[PDB]
TrEMBL record, chains B, C:
Cellular localisation: Virion
Protein name, UniProt field: Capsid protein VP1
Keyword annotations: Capsid protein, T=1 icosahedral capsid protein, Virion
Family named by the database record: Belongs to the parvoviridae capsid protein family.
GO molecular function terms listed in the Swiss-Prot or TrEMBL record: structural molecule activity
Record GO cellular component, one term: T=1 icosahedral viral capsid
Portion held of the full protein: 218 to 738 of 738
All residue ranges annotated as the Coat protein VP1/VP2 Parvovirus domain in the record: 1-493
Amino acid sequence: GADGVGSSSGNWHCDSTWLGDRVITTSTRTWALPTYNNHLYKQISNGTSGGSTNDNTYFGYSTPWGYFDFNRFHCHFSPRDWQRLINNNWGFRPKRLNFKLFNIQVKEVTQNEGTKTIANNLTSTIQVFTDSEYQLPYVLGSAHQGCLPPFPADVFMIPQYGYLTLNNGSQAVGRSSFYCLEYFPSQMLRTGNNFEFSYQFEDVPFHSS
Amino acid sequence: GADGVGSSSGNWHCDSTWLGDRVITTSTRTWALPTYNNHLYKQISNGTSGGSTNDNTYFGYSTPWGYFDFNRFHCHFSPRDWQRLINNNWGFRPKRLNFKLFNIQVKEVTQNEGTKTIANNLTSTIQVFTDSEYQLPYVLGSAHQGCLPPFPADVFMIPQYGYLTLNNGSQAVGRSSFYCLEYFPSQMLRTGNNFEFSYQFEDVPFHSSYAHSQSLDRLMNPLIDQYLYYLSRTQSTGGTQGTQQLLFSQAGPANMSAQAKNWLPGPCYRQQRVSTTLSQNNNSNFAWTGATKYHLNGRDSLVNPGVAMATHKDDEERFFPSSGVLMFGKQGAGRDNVDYSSVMLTSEEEIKTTNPVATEQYGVVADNLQQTNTGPIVGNVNSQGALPGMVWQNRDVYLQGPIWAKIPHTDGNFHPSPLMGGFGLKHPPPQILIKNTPVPADPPTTFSQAKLASFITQYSTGQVSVEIEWELQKENSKRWNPEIQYTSNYYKSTNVDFAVNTEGTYSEPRPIGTRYLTRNL
Amino acid sequence: GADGVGSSSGNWHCDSTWLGDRVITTSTRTWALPTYNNHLYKQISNGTSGGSTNDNTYFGYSTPWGYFDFNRFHCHFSPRDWQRLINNNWGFRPKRLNFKLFNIQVKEVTQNEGTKTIANNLTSTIQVFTDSEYQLPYVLGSAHQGCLPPFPADVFMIPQYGYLTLNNGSQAVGRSSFYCLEYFPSQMLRTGNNFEFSYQFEDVPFHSSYAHSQSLDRLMNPLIDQYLYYLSRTQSTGGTQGTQQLLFSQAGPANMSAQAKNWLPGPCYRQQRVSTTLSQNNNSNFAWTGATKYHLNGRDSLVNPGVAMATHKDDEERFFPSSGVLMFGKQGAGRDNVDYSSVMLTSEEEIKTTNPVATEQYGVVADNLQQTNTGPIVGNVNSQGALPGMVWQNRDVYLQGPIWAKIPHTDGNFHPSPLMGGFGLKHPPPQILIKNTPVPADPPTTFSQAKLASFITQYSTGQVSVEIEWELQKENSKRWNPEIQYTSNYYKSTNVDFAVNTEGTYSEPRPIGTRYLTRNL
């Protein structure tokens, strides 16, 4: 390993390299992950029995888990570097992306009268896994909030993870699916460890600009 | 080593791989181990001098140690993955399991006025050892609570370890055995270390999951007669005088009951019958009084469940034997004197073919010896032992039920297999024992002969992982029409079964039998 | 191939070779296979709504298929060759068998006015397959009729194939299984072709043919005393006052009954006793009513024969248990309510040593718990299960009896061996199934959605040959005086036994037990 607590597990890369046609754009942000659902799964629903009409009925669960959303451009392009792109080029498509967590530090907090006090917890861990088998509802693409903030100085809050499933009214049918995320292989991380994986985009047509 | 505090000592594996026939199932949970008995051994007992009767007398110790219990299926199978198992397969048995602790973090706590405050203690250790020589009372297999919670999000408390030993009344005899667990080789662990070992299950018969499609008496050929003869009639028939005469016949399709059969039903030990409909049962308490018991060393012990026996005959759903069936609770059901609605009732209906109905007589035999003047009299056999030519089915296993039990080591046993179901084993998986290493508070300056009576309140938490490689017996069968399969309801419901509810309480609505697929007897 | 119609596809082997210990016995018969169920499957049932009672309810199908049954000994042994076997040998078990069809010729027939005329159909075929995967209900072993006729000149009719399945009353349940036999790989045969396969019997214990020369209680030494003591007398004897006193003694030659013995009689399940002399039996019908039954799924099923038990004690020939013995017919005996004279009665007398008498109590045990004021009371044990220290003898086999049976595949069985006698097997010989390939008559010109309801009346005939390689356990014994041997009468008789009569009807006068030679227990 050769990491430990005394050493940092990574560096800070926010850069855009223009190499011939290929253009490599990277970014980095600071994230903070609050505990969700007091570590519980919850069935949530909205019935039309309330003010809701039959269009707004849903059924679904809200897990304690949370998920990074980089899906928006302004994460990956500084407006200038987004100017060089649209002025000089007809079309562009991604090829491969790479992803890293590092410098993970865990903290705990106690409430004693009105004193709000924080400390470090060295041993405590966080769990990380990607679904490479697409075995989960893929909830990116609906343009929900919480993407990496555009301006790299910002520090953002990882959004909670939940999903919707079949309903009839507020109730559920037999095909209603449930998922317990702790049921997937995941990696447990300690303030010394980092997490990294490499993806490769499938063949895709040039986006016409 | 190359671990240290800054690095995590493991990963999180909860997965089920189906590889050909072999099926590898792993699980992981979060555990928290409270300090037990202020680090003391204690003689505990219950004497009949109190309200207790002579049956409830025990003698035993409660150690500070505690032990992981994974013994129940629902630890190792997610209900879906438990569906693929019972729909597509005849039989399954374990082969080898592997076990891991990791990410162990120790904590201490102090009480200052009403402030309840926790911190980390880096150096403090916990002790871990398995008994691979079986030198301890093996207390798994009695289906005590505290097994890894079914739904992996849960975080559970490791149960305390204690055991019982010989008594006479509340006192003890000379053979009463004592054990000091610190007397075994054990491993001491630091937040960086992990613990792992590999076990291998001994050769064991495939647990049969299937229901015979032919009741044991129907093995005949419907069309063809038999060449054997039986005694049909003792008396000359169709005359005013009753003169006795021996007439013989063959048992054909018309009378199938008299046919000569090559086998017998399984053994039978009767139970009392109880109806779910209240009005039908008697008005009394016969629960304990009319119960089916066995007498041992002056202590009458109720037989729970008893030998595997068909719950109720055809066209009666409601009647069930007194103790005959396993009974689980619904999620959140009370501990004591809880109403019928909260418990769940397993059913033996699958085995009705090969085994006698639980609540009914096994057979009828002749009481007397007939003569000219003596009319024959036949009695009932309520309890019938094993005779040559008997086949039977062991008790089914359920998703909630226990996986195995340790066969007692004794000179003579007949067809070992637990009554709760599962597998009998002569070398079960060892039991893991674990304890916080006691940390004494500040002793006085001046020496004191006495042992240290103070300690730092402490508890530890970590992650545990267990996998079990299973072997399957593929189902190969020519039956034309569809089988029966376990399937979730098609119709709508308030909320999904086997899944969380509004407040986050996981719930399993009904037990799951292992026998659906059919096999020709 | 090199067969064609002009050439015969086999030979005729009926022979018995005695080679050292191994004894190879073959046989051949002529068979004729009628068309069954106009080539239809049929659900058949018997409901209790008719005259039937709830015991006789069945549900099942009758297929067009039919099956060779060789299962009975008298197929494979000519009585002489069955004499050499039981006189000179202790025990025998099969090893491998081989099976052949050949010289298959197919025929059709037409009815024109009263003219009944037959011809040959060259192309028409028959289908043959064995189940080597045991995927079908195995219906051999219930001793149905139709086995290869004993006397090789006879020509026999292959019996129809059907099976029974679960029911509730006359209806069926969800586990009711259906089978379409055309759904298995089978071989189609043309008058030139033949069919052959080789089987190998699994390891099986030698069937014991012998009678212990020492009754189980007599194992002692007549001359010498024992060093153990028993309780002879509870009361001081030879005084006017009855003061109780414990006196002990040794059991010597004088009292052999009290000696300590190392074993027990075999298990016992009582039967009702019946005398061949009519006047001695009661006046009633106790046949079914006082019968020895076992209760299964609400259907009371008579126990035929029951566990192997000595027929009658010494110096009573006439008494025999109700169902306890196998009962055959005399040649040409009626099917139903036939008089005593026509049936034959096997007898268990050989095993009287090691097993209890069938019609009498197994033992006596204490009912109550004695006191000063309480006189001891002892009850009878009518049915006694298996206890440690019991030895017993399985049921003898007869020349007419069945050779084997298929052990049901179930998790737990105790000492498998059929009640009819013979060998238990977990992989019996497969059963051969055979059917005429249906030949449709001329369908209409215009297409019709419906399946073809007409066929050409047809039947087929051919030759079948089967051999069985047997292993013998040679009889090696030092007994000085002659043994008992099975021998034909010396005195004259109307006509030879085991041989044809005037009109050509082969007849076998009496059953043949397998136990003559003696062995020291």
